[PDB]
């Protein structure tokens, strides 16, 4: 009995076919890059103050003091959710009494905005926050729509695998890419907040589905070695490239409708790949469609320029290939033994905390001091070296110390943020970027570490559980940034403390480097 990897070895690990599949599937991830974190610009909050109509007979003296003041960063700014009672202000404004002299501004009555907000346009022209006034009493609705986006991402992860197994990798890939672009485009015509949130949920469901489908297809077509490079550096780097390109558009386009129009344009180009990406021959063989798999294999061989007589490719054996034993599906197997139970709980906590930190640090860029566009670009740029370093470390160093050090650096750098004085405010940004670098590195390494820790019989189930925990952590991430209203540094304190605790936790996991991967739970390494 041969194996698929052994029968198709005559194609070679690298060449025009593998090069084209690799770069066409990796480039298909660029739309996933700027779509996920577009909330940084679509749902931004400009400066605002209580509106006052023009019908009030207020002189220039009162027109400068219609809103109470508050201190912020030492300086004073207008109150964002209160205004002096317009009836009372006008009552003696008409009579000629002057502000601050006759009537004490510290004793006047206050009321919430009855006529709306102003939403200064220094940086943004319009956002969904300005569109539907998601401020003050309704400010909690801004992080809710982001959480619902990640909820949709969560739900899409469950059904995408089953759907692609039932209907094929390419079909689901392109269908979900089409639905993601169609629903993202329809948001331009949103009529109310509810329609926008529902469409955002479906957008996230398609974004995850067309990411998982492309990942599976790429990992199934490519060879034994190029598979790991594609899985770890290809898609991640192209996602980072998309994330880096996201702020370049937002710099020129500052209207959420036009920004959505621009960000959805590249997704249309990805439809041109239908004639250049083949179906996974392994899946077709598993379906019994050996003729199509043979056709695709012969086309690939012709593309690579390898002469393929019967003595080097016999399609009869293609119908009688070996098949690996099914992995267990009962989730109880992960919790019926002490060691695997402890490992699973530690992996869940690790993945959830890393995801929470990674997304909280990415969503908090608009609040840092400096240019929001440059800060977003820097946040995206540091991911590339993080991925390269993660790959090199996994290639040459033990995972336990590598991840422990990465998490320690990331968590510790965030705690020092409160100590930076305003004279060197820019030192805060570099600390945040270093923390993002460390968190990205740890997030990249944790996948390979967890995949190595679990045995073959429950590897897929354990990785899936850890991924679901990571999705939950991502869902929770936007609410950590929301705490910035109640305290400027609380989100960083929380994320740093959790990252440090996770770093200490990593030192208790067993070390898989240099040890053969186990096949059964009894061969699983024992926790410290
Ligand atoms: Na994609």
The DSSP string of 298-321 is: HHHHHHHT----TTT--TTGGGS-
Written as six digits, the tokens of 32 are: 């996933």
Instruction: Please check if 436 is assigned to a binding site.
Output: no
CB distance 181 to 203 below 8 Å? no
- Report the distance separating Cα 249 and Cα 332, nearest Å: 48
Any domain includes 241: no
Q: How many residues does the chain have?
A: 528
- Looking at the fold, whether 199 and 303 belong to one and the same domain comes out as yes
Give the list of residues 6+ apart from residue 513 with CB closer than 8 angstroms, or none.
Answer: 397, 398, 399, 400
CA distances from 222 to 14, 25, 219, 281 (A): 9, 11, 6, 11
CA–centroid distance, 236 to ligand 1, in Å, is 12
Instruction: Please check if 435 is assigned to a binding site.
Output: no
3 state SS of 347: helix
- Report the distance separating Cα 255 and Cα 232, nearest Å: 35
CA–centroid distance, 27 to ligand 1, in Å, is 8
- Looking at the fold, whether 306 and 339 belong to one and the same domain comes out as no
CA–centroid distance, 470 to ligand 1, in Å, is 20
CB distance 417 to 432 below 8 Å? yes
- Looking at the fold, whether 358 and 471 belong to one and the same domain comes out as yes
User: Domain range for residue 523?
Assistant: 328-528
Q: What is the experimental resolution, given in Å to one decimal place?
A: 3.0
Any domain includes 247: no
| Burial class for 227, CB neighbours closer than 10 Å (0-12, 13-18, 19+) | middle
| First-to-last C-alpha distance (Å) of the chain | 40
CA–centroid distance, 508 to ligand 1, in Å, is 37
* CB environment 58-85: b (16+ within 10 A), e (fewer): beeebeebbbeeeeeeeeeebebbbbbe
CA–centroid distance, 35 to ligand 1, in Å, is 10
- Looking at the fold, whether 398 and 468 belong to one and the same domain comes out as yes
Any domain includes 504: yes
Of the residues 294, 323, 352, which one is the last residue of a structural domain?
323
CA–centroid distance, 384 to ligand 1, in Å, is 19
Instruction: Please check if 178 is assigned to a binding site.
Output: no
CA–centroid distance, 242 to ligand 1, in Å, is 11
- Report the distance separating Cα 235 and Cα 233, nearest Å: 6
Any domain includes 398: yes
| Burial class for 269, CB neighbours closer than 10 Å (0-12, 13-18, 19+) | exposed
Tell which residue, 159, 51, 162, 24, has the closest CA to residue 111. 51
Written as six digits, the tokens of 289 are: 């469609």
CA–centroid distance, 30 to ligand 1, in Å, is 6
- Report the distance separating Cα 29 and Cα 222, nearest Å: 17
Any domain includes 243: no
Instruction: Please check if 106 is assigned to a binding site.
Output: no
Query: Which residue matches tokens 């297809």?
Result: 217
Any domain includes 418: yes
CA–centroid distance, 246 to ligand 1, in Å, is 15
- Looking at the fold, whether 215 and 283 belong to one and the same domain comes out as yes
- Looking at the fold, whether 175 and 261 belong to one and the same domain comes out as yes
DSSP class of residue 80 equals: S
CA–centroid distance, 491 to ligand 1, in Å, is 31
Of the residues 296, 323, 350, which one is the last residue of a structural domain?
323
CA–centroid distance, 424 to ligand 1, in Å, is 41
CA–centroid distance, 513 to ligand 1, in Å, is 33
Check which CATH number belongs to the domain holding 14 and give it. 1.20.1250
- Looking at the fold, whether 430 and 491 belong to one and the same domain comes out as yes
- Report the distance separating Cα 181 and Cα 270, nearest Å: 10
CA–centroid distance, 211 to ligand 1, in Å, is 5
DSSP class of residue 232 equals: I
At residue 71, φ and ψ (nearest 5 deg) are -90, 140
Beta bridge mates, 72: 75
Tell which residue, 272, 289, 271, has the closest CA to residue 280. 289
Q: How many domains does the chain have?
A: 2
- Looking at the fold, whether 300 and 347 belong to one and the same domain comes out as no
Any domain includes 515: yes
CA–centroid distance, 95 to ligand 1, in Å, is 66
- Looking at the fold, whether 398 and 415 belong to one and the same domain comes out as yes
CA–centroid distance, 465 to ligand 1, in Å, is 23
- Looking at the fold, whether 388 and 301 belong to one and the same domain comes out as no
Of the residues 295, 323, 351, which one is the last residue of a structural domain?
323
CA distances from 427 to 412, 421, 434 (A): 15, 9, 11
CA–centroid distance, 39 to ligand 1, in Å, is 18
- Looking at the fold, whether 299 and 406 belong to one and the same domain comes out as no
- Report the distance separating Cα 96 and Cα 116, nearest Å: 27
Written as six digits, the tokens of 236 are: 């991640």
Instruction: Please check if 224 is assigned to a binding site.
Output: yes
CA–centroid distance, 29 to ligand 1, in Å, is 4
Method: cryo-EM
Check which CATH number belongs to the domain holding 391 and give it. 1.20.1250.20
CA–centroid distance, 267 to ligand 1, in Å, is 8
CA distances from 294 to 10, 11, 223, 526 (A): 13, 13, 17, 45
CA–centroid distance, 214 to ligand 1, in Å, is 7
Instruction: Please check if 219 is assigned to a binding site.
Output: yes
CA–centroid distance, 176 to ligand 1, in Å, is 9
CB distance 33 to 241 below 8 Å? yes
DSSP class of residue 428 equals: H
Instruction: Please check if 33 is assigned to a binding site.
Output: no
Written as six digits, the tokens of 480 are: 């950590």
Secondary structure element (H or E) that encloses residue 71, with its range: strand 69-72
Any domain includes 8: yes
Secondary structure element (H or E) that encloses residue 111, with its range: strand 110-111
At residue 117, φ and ψ (nearest 5 deg) are -120, 170
- Report the distance separating Cα 372 and Cα 364, nearest Å: 10
- Looking at the fold, whether 309 and 410 belong to one and the same domain comes out as no
Rounded to 10 deg, the angle between the 235-252 and 16-27 helix axes is 40
Instruction: Please check if 191 is assigned to a binding site.
Output: no
What count of other Cβ atoms lies within 10 Å of the Cβ of residue 121?
12
CA–centroid distance, 405 to ligand 1, in Å, is 33
Query: Which residue matches tokens 């943004």?
Result: 124
Give the list of residues 6+ apart from residue 136 with CB closer than 8 angstroms, or none.
Answer: 80, 81, 112, 113
CA–centroid distance, 215 to ligand 1, in Å, is 9
Secondary structure element (H or E) that encloses residue 218, with its range: helix 193-221
């Amino acid at each position: 009995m041969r194996d698929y990897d052994e029968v198709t070895a005559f194609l070679g690990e690298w060449g025009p076919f593998q090069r084209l599949i690799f770069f066409l599937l990796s480039a298909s991830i660029i739309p996933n890059g700027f779509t996920g974190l577009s909330s940084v610009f679509l749902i931004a909050t400009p400066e605002h103050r209580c509106r006052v109509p023009d019908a009030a007979n207020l002189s220039s003296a009162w027109r400068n003091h219609t809103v109470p003041l508050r201190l912020r960063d030492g300086r004073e700014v207008p109150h964002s959710c209160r205004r002096y009672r317009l009836a009372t202000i006008a009552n003696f404004s008409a009579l000629g009494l002057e502000p601050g002299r006759d009537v004490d501004l510290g004793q006047l009555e206050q009321e919430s905005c009855l006529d709306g907000w102003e939403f200064s346009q220094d940086v943004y022209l319009s956002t969904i926050v300005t569109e539907w006034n998601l401020v003050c009493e309704d400010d909690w609705k801004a992080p809710l729509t982001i959480s619902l986006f990640f909820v949709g991402v969560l739900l899409g992860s469950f059904i995408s695998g089953q759907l692609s197994d039932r209907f094929g990798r390419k079909n689901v890939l392109f269908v979900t890419m089409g639905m993601q672009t169609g629903f993202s485009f329809l948001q331009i015509f949103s009529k109310n907040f509810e329609m926008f949130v529902v469409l955002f949920v479906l957008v996230g469901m398609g974004q995850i589905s067309n990411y998982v489908a492309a990942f599976v297809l790429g990992t199934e077509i490519l060879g034994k070695s190029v598979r790991i490079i594609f899985s770890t550096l290809g898609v991640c780097i192209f996602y980072a490239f998309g994330y880096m390109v996201l702020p370049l558009f937002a710099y020129f386009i500052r209207d959420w409708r036009m920004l959505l129009v621009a960000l959805t344009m590249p997704g249309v180009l990805c439809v041109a790949l239908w004639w250049f990406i083949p179906e996974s021959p392994r899946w077709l063989i598993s379906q019994g469609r050996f003729e199509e798999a043979e056709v695709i294999i012969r086309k690939a061989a012709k593309a690579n320029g390898i002469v393929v007589p019967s003595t080097i490719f016999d399609p009869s054996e293609l119908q009688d290939l070996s098949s690996k034993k099914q992995q267990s599906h009962n989730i109880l197997d992960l919790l019926r033994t002490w060691n695997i139970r402890m490992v699973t709980i530690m992996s869940i906590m690790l993945w959830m905390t890393i995801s929470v930190g990674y997304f909280g640090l990415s969503l908090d860029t608009p609040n840092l001091h400096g240019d929001i566009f440059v800060n977003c670009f820097l946040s995206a740029m540091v991911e590339v070296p993080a991925y390269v370093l993660a790959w090199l470390l996994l290639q040459y160093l033990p995972r336990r110390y590598s991840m422990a050090t990465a998490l320690f650096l990331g968590g510790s750098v965030l705690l020092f943020m409160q100590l930076v004085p305003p004279d060197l405010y820019y030192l805060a940004t570099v600390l945040v970027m270093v923390g993002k670098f460390g968190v990205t590195a740890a997030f990249s390494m944790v996948y390979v570490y967890t995949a190595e820790l679990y045995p073959t019989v429950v590897r897929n189930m354990g990785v899936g559980v850890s991924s679901t925990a990571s999705r939950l952590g991502s869902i929770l991430s936007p609410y950590f940034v929301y705490l910035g209203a109640y305290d400027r540094f609380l989100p960083y304190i929380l994320m740093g403390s959790l990252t440090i605790l996770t770093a200490i936790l990593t030192l208790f996991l067993p070390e898989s480097f240099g040890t053969p991967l186990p096949d059964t739970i009894d061969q699983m390494l024992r926790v410290k």
